[PDB]
Design a protein around this ligand. Structure first.
Ligand SMILES: C=CCn1c(=O)c2cnc(Nc3ccc(N4CCN(C)CC4)cc3)nc2n1-c1cccc([C@@H](C)O)n1
Ligand SMILES: [Cl-]
Length: 261
């Protein structure tokens, strides 16, 4: 007797974690496929609730963009919350990276620049609406297949001004954010995107803390396994510059000559 059951037919579980479950579903009325997240309703006044609120109100603000996972609807039923999003048939960037690492394929220089540009366009859009994503990483980039990358998982999204900062994944987190400096949050999304491209390029698992973590925030790129041009390398280096004002904005990113291609 539920809306979920009523409007959708559930095809396959495509994700699970502390966030709950995600299902590939067909909507009966239109025959389209959607990714529907089903989670227990968070305790009131909890982090989980704060997180869930950041996401509903990001949708309220953002609307539709070709490099952001489209949001269609959200509701609550039983003791659960449901979020209906666009289904990206290529899964997440994280999955693709695992898969490259398995059948030994790889993301080429060219394809790495394409990833950077496309996610950059998504960020440029979010930033222009005075928001920041604050959890950019492979598992939150989705792929549609000839290939579109789309930013999803908006649960950390916050305002540039008066930001409610739930810190993202420590692996991708810029030092100034850890230092409780929120005067240039957009540049933290930039830092994270650079490390996201480095992952796609085949780097070893990023450090969660300790010496190697600090070395990166000193502006040093993790070791790669392949041949990146000096100029693409420099672009990635400056995106993880200790000084966030030295990092390009999303708008300067997508107009950069190395990416024009
Ligand atoms: C709705 C919620 C968020 N979300 C989207 O907005 C969204 C859009 N497209 C897709 N496409 C998609 C994802 C995974 C697969 N795989 C099927 C094959 N197996 C082997 C690996 C997984 C296939 C297709 N998935 C999405 N969401 C989703 C799925 C899972 C986990 C998470 C986060 C919580 O980590 N998010
Ligand atoms: Cl800024």
């Amino acid at each position: 007797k539920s809306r979920y059951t009523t409007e959708f037919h559930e095809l396959e579980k495509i994700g699970s974690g502390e966030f709950g479950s995600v299902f590939k579903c067909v909507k009966r009325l239109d025959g389209c496929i959607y990714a529907i997240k089903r989670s227990k309703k968070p305790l009131a006044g909890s982090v989980d609730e704060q997180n869930a609120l950041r996401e509903v109100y990001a949708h309220a603000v953002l609307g539709q963009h070709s490099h952001v996972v489209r949001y269609f609807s959200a509701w609550a039923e039983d003791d659960h919350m449901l979020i209906q999003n666009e289904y990206c048939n290529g899964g997440s960037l994280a999955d693709a990276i695992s898969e490259n690492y398995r059948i030994m394929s790889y993301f080429k220089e060219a394809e790495l620049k394409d990833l950077l540009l496309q996610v950059g366009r998504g960020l440029r859009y979010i930033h222009s609406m005075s928001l920041v994503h604050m959890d950019i990483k492979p598992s939150n980039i989705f792929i549609s297949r000839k290939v579109m990358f789309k930013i999803g998982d908006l649960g950390h999204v916050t305002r540039i001004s008066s930001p409610q900062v739930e810190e993202g994944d420590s692996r991708f987190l810029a030092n100034e954010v850890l230092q409780e400096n929120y005067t240039h949050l957009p540049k933290a999304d930039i830092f994270a995107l650079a490390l996201t491209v480095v992952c796609a390029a085949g780097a070893e698992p990023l450090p969660r803390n300790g010496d190697q973590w600090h070395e990166i925030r000193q502006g040093r790129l993790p070791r790669i396994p392949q041949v990146l041009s000096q100029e693409f390398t420099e672009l990635l280096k400056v995106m993880i510059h200790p000084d966030p004002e030295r990092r390009p904005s999303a708008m300067a990113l997508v107009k950069h000559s190395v990416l024009l291609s």
